[PDB]
Ligand binder design. Structure first.
Ligand SMILES: [Ca+2]
Ligand SMILES: [Ca+2]
Ligand SMILES: [Ca+2]
Ligand SMILES: [Ca+2]
Ligand SMILES: [Ca+2]
Ligand SMILES: [Ca+2]
Ligand SMILES: [Ca+2]
Ligand SMILES: [Ca+2]
Ligand SMILES: [Ca+2]
Ligand SMILES: [Ca+2]
Ligand SMILES: [Ca+2]
Ligand SMILES: [Ca+2]
Ligand SMILES: [Ca+2]
Ligand SMILES: [Ca+2]
Ligand SMILES: [Ca+2]
Ligand SMILES: [Ca+2]
Ligand SMILES: [Ca+2]
Ligand SMILES: [Ca+2]
Ligand SMILES: [Ca+2]
Ligand SMILES: [Ca+2]
Ligand SMILES: [Ca+2]
Ligand SMILES: [Ca+2]
Ligand SMILES: [Ca+2]
Ligand SMILES: [Ca+2]
Ligand SMILES: [Cl-]
Ligand SMILES: [Cl-]
Ligand SMILES: [K+]
Ligand SMILES: [K+]
Ligand SMILES: [K+]
Ligand SMILES: [K+]
Lengths: 57, 96, 100, 87, 98, 84, 55
DNA sequence: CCTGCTTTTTTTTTTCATGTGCCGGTCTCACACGTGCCTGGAGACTAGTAAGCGCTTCTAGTGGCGGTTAAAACGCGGTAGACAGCGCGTACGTGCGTTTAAGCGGTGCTAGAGCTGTCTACGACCAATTGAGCGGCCTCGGCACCGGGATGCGTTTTTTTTCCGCGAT
DNA sequence: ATCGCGGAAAAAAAACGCATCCCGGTGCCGAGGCCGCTCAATTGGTCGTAGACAGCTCTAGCACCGCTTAAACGCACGTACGCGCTGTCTACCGCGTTTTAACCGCCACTAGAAGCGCTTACTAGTCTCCAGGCACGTGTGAGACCGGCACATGAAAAAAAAAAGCAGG
């Protein structure tokens, strides 16, 4: 799963971000590692709907 | 028949009689007390086990118990518990 | 006519996109390192740290805070707001069991 | 021999912009001004809790130097297991 | 005739169940539920009665505590009425839910 | 072989209210009772699954209180009073 | 603490409620046992203020 | 706008009645405690090795320097979000009359929990042998970082369509 | 419903500006892999015991009964709360200018992590022995329950007093 995330970002080498993207996009791995912090992993892109531009409309 | 299940009940009674000589305890309450002592026993023993493993020691000593207590108990409780433990070990080593 | 000026919300949204795409520590390293030393003085005087111990600490802190800000955001949205307030933080920590 | 040592008010070097960035990565769009000092409080408590246990591990090993492992063991105790620094 | 206003019995109930320790779900219906659920994992299962009482004690304690948190989420939204969105925010912040 | 099924509705509206009341809840949406039943179901599913796993491991056809205690401990819902 | 709680209720015997009252009313024991269900303990009386009527 | 006023809203308060702590009989079962007696802790021994100790090696932690420039700090301006009112519709609380099935105490049956003794397959331990995996060391392509150009998109002002919205029919 | 005609509001294109995306060029260090050597896994063997099994006892789990009545159910009513819509007002965002100190790359000085070899004080082990703690079992007093009790608090009421509105002037 990480290898595939690396391939997306056009990288030969897996880095901690790729592991994090792998794990947090997988229902099951995310549950297995629900209480685990991956150094240098970041978080998944996620902007709540209400926060997106609605504005004058 | 014979089908023995150890428990801490007689020791919970002994302590109860020091602290409140005229009060008793229901069997469910005694059950809870039993659960409690096995729980904390396991928490202390486990953290101790770990301490010694992390430090490449084969032996759980009173020093692993003490450190484990500082890790597991909240502040004031940890102070009194360390005191009672230290007291007990001092009193014991002075009796052979 | 004027210089360009984006509307309130827009650059905020852009900053969210920027920081969610990246993984670099967002707290300046030296100020954090000093803060770690300072706090450690309360428990034991004259400590050394491995530099990776300070990195470990900073990595763990930022993950925690980023974690808490997600939950805090939800609490604010739950109250029909878009602005996080201290009471949102307190509700999230209370529900997490970090406070009574 | 007696060394350097500083007990500044370093908490302020966790600045407003740095906190704004942390919130950003957490998906927050808008922030009350009361948040920044509140976040410093929380951060301080978090670090106090982790540092206390890490130094407890340090003292036990009869070392003067806190190691990554002490931090890692501390974070695992606090239910905040960390990957990447050993263990 | 005499009539309490909406909420006054509710508080009266609260004071009563907070004073007491007895189980609040009826035992036979709970026991069938337990058996029914267990069926899916393994057939022809027997239960010690104490095992069923253990599960019932644990479910109720969980639910009561979940309702404490749910109540705070309702109040956080300037309501006095708990709703599903309150339980869902609670479970999410607890980490039970995605 | 036992007669069975859909006993989740035997978790009554009043019983759910009583639980909420012990949790200090004063007013209750109509949608709560069915949401709660869902939650309750998941909670028992998780606990029982684990209790039954300990039972099969022990090669027993009877779920014990200890099996439940151990399962509850694994799920971080440590229970005192049942042979812990 | 539980024996004290028993005596307030004019009871000779400690029951699980007395242990519960004991533990939940003591800040540190409550922390030590924050993730523990005491069987037949119930909960502390506690009603959020907004839910009370204006007196 | 102006008395008046008048008519409701709030009030204030008592009291009137509801359901809740309190009390004194009386009943029963579970705590408590005595009695056997099995197991597991203790006393006294030997043998072996975990770990404290002293000492030496050399890792990596600490501190100090100066210059660059990215980042923090601060004020100005004003958009839009927080927040307080309020008014409207009905979802929930309450209570009462009807219906359901939990709880209780009991008997009867037997699955299966749990125990015992025996036999043996399987794991610990040991000593000799050697190849997997370590630390150390060199290399060169992936990746970071740059500038340039492409393109996606936010914002505002001037332009076309839309959805009303008023009565007058 | 139907005109009619604006009336407002709303969506349109369009034109402009600013940020992000993505390229190749340049450059360099960290992944990849090769090497030599040590020590941890393997081989072959012996030895003691864990646990699977057959067989047994008897616990407690399951099924059923037929009482009693508490609890769940459904139904009606109407209060109070969820929730939408408006208006207000300043907290917060965006941005430009000024100020601060993090970052970098490198060094120099040495505390202290860490490794080794040496010696003994502790612990695992085992036999003998016995008393502390277990299961059984019996008794009586604590606690549950019941009727009446009495003492809280909220709702219902009149008596009264302060604000919504019309009404008329
Ligand atoms: Ca040393
Ligand atoms: Ca008392
Ligand atoms: Ca205390
Ligand atoms: Ca009066
Ligand atoms: Ca009496
Ligand atoms: Ca007695
Ligand atoms: Ca007796
Ligand atoms: Ca050694
Ligand atoms: Ca030496
Ligand atoms: Ca200025
Ligand atoms: Ca608005
Ligand atoms: Ca290598
Ligand atoms: Ca590079
Ligand atoms: Ca660029
Ligand atoms: Ca170029
Ligand atoms: Ca290569
Ligand atoms: Ca509202
Ligand atoms: Ca509505
Ligand atoms: Ca305001
Ligand atoms: Ca620089
Ligand atoms: Ca030296
Ligand atoms: Ca005896
Ligand atoms: Ca006994
Ligand atoms: Ca009784
Ligand atoms: Cl707040
Ligand atoms: Cl909802
Ligand atoms: K060092
Ligand atoms: K059985
Ligand atoms: K075998
Ligand atoms: K020693």
């Amino acid at each position: 799963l990480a290898g595939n995330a690396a391939r997306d970002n056009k990288k030969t080498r897996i880095i901690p971000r790729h592991l994090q993207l792998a794990i947090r996009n997988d229902e099951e791995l995310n549950k297995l590692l629900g209480r685990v912090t991956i150094a240098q992993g970041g978080v998944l892109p996620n902007i709540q709907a209400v926060l997106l531009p609605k504005k004058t409309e | 028949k014979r089908s023995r299940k150890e428990s801490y009940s007689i020791y919970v009674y002994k302590v109860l009689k020091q602290v409140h000589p005229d009060t008793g305890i229901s069997s469910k309450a005694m059950g809870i007390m039993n659960s409690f002592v096995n729980d904390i026993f396991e928490r202390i023993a486990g953290e101790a086990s770990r301490l010694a493993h992390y430090n490449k020691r084969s032996t759980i000593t009173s020093r692993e118990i003490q450190t484990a207590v500082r890790l597991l108990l909240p502040g004031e409780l940890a102070k009194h518990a360390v005191s009672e433990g230290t007291k007990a070990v001092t009193k014991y080593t002075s009796a052979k | 006519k004027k210089p360009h000026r984006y509307r309130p919300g827009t650059v905020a949204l852009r900053e969210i996109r920027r920081y969610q795409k990246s993984t670099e520590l967002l707290i300046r390293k030296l100020p954090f390192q000093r803060l770690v030393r300072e706090i450690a003085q309360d428990f034991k005087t004259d400590l050394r740290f491995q530099s990776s111990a300070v990195m470990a600490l900073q990595e763990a802190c930022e993950a925690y805070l980023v974690g808490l800000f997600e939950d805090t955001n939800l609490c604010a949205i739950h109250a029909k707001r878009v602005t996080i307030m201290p009471k949102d933080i307190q509700l999230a920590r209370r529900i997490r069991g970090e406070r009574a | 021999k007696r060394h350097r040592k500083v007990l500044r008010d370093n908490i302020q070097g966790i600045t407003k912009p740095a906190i704004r960035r942390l919130a950003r990565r957490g998906g927050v769009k808008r922030i009350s001004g009361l948040i920044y000092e509140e976040t410093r409080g929380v951060l301080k408590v978090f670090l106090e809790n982790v540092i206390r246990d890490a130094v407890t591990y340090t003292e036990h090993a009869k070392r003067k130097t806190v190691t990554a492992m002490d931090v890692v063991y501390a974070l695992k105790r606090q239910g905040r297991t960390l990957y990447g620094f050993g263990g």
